[PDB]
Design a protein around this ligand. Structure first.
Ligand code: CLR
Ligand code: OLC
Ligand code: OLC
Ligand code: OLC
Ligand code: OLC
Ligand code: 7LD
Ligand code: MG
Length: 355
């Protein structure tokens, strides 16, 4: 007789319906057809699967006093499905943070799908010892008739390899991606004060030497952010030919072209930083919500005999559901911090599917 199962039934439904909306939005909405959102759909499938396969069986054990209700050889399957989905969710978030950083340092839907299949095939290979060595020995998967990973070596290896190692790569790549966009917003501010300064130099000039010098330093700055460079080179031969006046009215024609490319590359820097902040919330919530479970998991092993393992087991039964609540909160962030997901989720609820 448990009041917990009611509270846990809400978490299964918000998981399933929330993440169905995300899979529907990336499949259907043409504004969301980029590589990041393809990883977020794949993550949503894992969340939905966690709420279909893992979370209802977890609710069932609460209803049988943590005694394993199902057939014994279904224990290792439930432990494999949960760890498979949990390994995929962290290695996806690592693969997003990694893939976005490379993109800043670099200039397809198949390009993304190949990365996603790689992450899933890695997460199948990692989780493989759980049934291979646990369907053979129930000792590794049972503890006083309770289905939990009981093998301490699998817990330790599994905690770092499945959770801590990709977390570290993710928290490094997120920092370096923020530092990359602060450099690119900074480098674009610098070239503005090169271009804006030499447009003021050209309209003060008496002689062809001052315009040719200032057009030369405008072209150099033009090279860091093609139309502008050619337009500048066009005004240079005017200044080389000594046509100062002709050069001076040529360079205020550049001024309408400079604003057009400065505010385009500078809107798109601001869009990435807005997007980086939204993924950061997604990253922050996965670490914080799963941290109590994974730390307790380790202290259960470290103070094996020293600590009250009845209480430490009772803390895990709470903390595993804080992390299950994380499945429900990817799609709420998407509502609150993206107009494209919110508009999509609005139409899907009112049952309009046309874009
Ligand atoms: C909030 C995030 C970042 C971390 C939270 C971890 C907390 C909730 C966990 C991790 C380790 C846990 C402790 C591990 C060991 C023991 C000794 C045991 O005899 C009583 C409970 C007690 C004292 C636990 C209390 C809860 C605990 C402190
Ligand atoms: C992007 C869309 C889909 C990616 C695939 C998502 C589907 C992932 C399902 C998990 C899976 O493939 O399970 C493997 C199996 O359990 C091992 O034997
Ligand atoms: C994942 C690969 C392993 C899956 C194969 C193991 C399934 C075991 C199973 O279904 O066992 C139930 C049976 O009723 C018990 O007596
Ligand atoms: C060539 C060497 C072969 C030696 C075979 C000895 C068999 C010993 C028995 C059991 C486990 C041994 C292997 C454990 C490897 C774990 C690797 C892994 O990724 O596990 C993750 C964890 O299980 C969840 O996340
Ligand atoms: C919002 C819900 C957040 C909490 C999720 C359910 C917590 C719960 O009931 O966990 C089982 C209980 O702690 C032990 O039987
Ligand atoms: C309700 C009881 N269940 C369900 C099978 C658990 O104890 C799960 C055990 C896990 C676990 C142990 C040890 C190492 C690990 N790496 C990654 C995970 C992991 C996933 C982690 N899940 C989220 C809970
Ligand atoms: Mg200046």
């Amino acid at each position: 007789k448990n009041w917990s199962a009611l509270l846990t039934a809400v978490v299964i439904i918000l998981t399933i319906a929330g993440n169905i909306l995300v899979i529907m939005a990336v499949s259907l909405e043409k504004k969301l057809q980029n590589a990041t959102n393809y990883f977020l759909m794949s993550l949503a499938i894992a969340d939905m699967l966690l709420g279909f396969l893992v979370m209802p069986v977890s609710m069932l054990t609460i209803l049988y006093g943590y005694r394993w209700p199902l057939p014994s050889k279904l224990c290792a399957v439930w432990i494999y499905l949960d760890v498979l989905f949990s390994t995929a969710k962290i290695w996806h978030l690592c693969a997003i943070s990694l893939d976005r950083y490379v993109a800043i340092q670099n200039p397809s839907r198949t390009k993304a799908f190949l990365k996603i299949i790689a992450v899933w095939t890695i997460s199948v290979g990692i989780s493989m010892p759980i049934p291979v060595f646990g369907l053979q020995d129930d000792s590794k998967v049972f503890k006083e008739g309770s289905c939990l990973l009981a093998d301490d070596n699998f817990v330790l290896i599994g905690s770092f390899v499945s959770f801590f190692i990709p977390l570290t790569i993710m928290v490094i790549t997120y920092f370096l991606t923020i530092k990359s966009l602060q450099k690119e917003a900074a480098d674009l501010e610098d070239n503005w004060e090169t271009l804006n300064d030499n447009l003021k130099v050209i309209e003060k000039a008496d002689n062809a030497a001052q315009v040719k010098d200032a057009l030369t330093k405008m072209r150099a700055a033009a090279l860091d952010a093609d139309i502008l460079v050619g337009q500048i080179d066009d005004a240079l031969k005017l200044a080389n030919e000594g046509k100062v006046k002709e050069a001076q009215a040529a360079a205020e024609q550049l001024k309408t072209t400079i604003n057009a490319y400065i505010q385009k590359y500078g809107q798109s820097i601001s869009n990435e930083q807005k997007a980086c902040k939204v993924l950061g919330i997604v990253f922050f919530l996965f670490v914080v919500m799963w941290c109590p479970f994974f730390i307790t998991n380790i202290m259960a092993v470290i103070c094996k005999e020293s600590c009250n393992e009845d209480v430490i087991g009772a803390l895990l039964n709470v903390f595993v559901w804080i992390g299950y609540l994380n499945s429900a909160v990817n799609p709420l962030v998407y509502t609150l911090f993206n107009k494209t997901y919110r508009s999509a989720f609005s139409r899907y609820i009112q049952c309009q599917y046309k874009e």
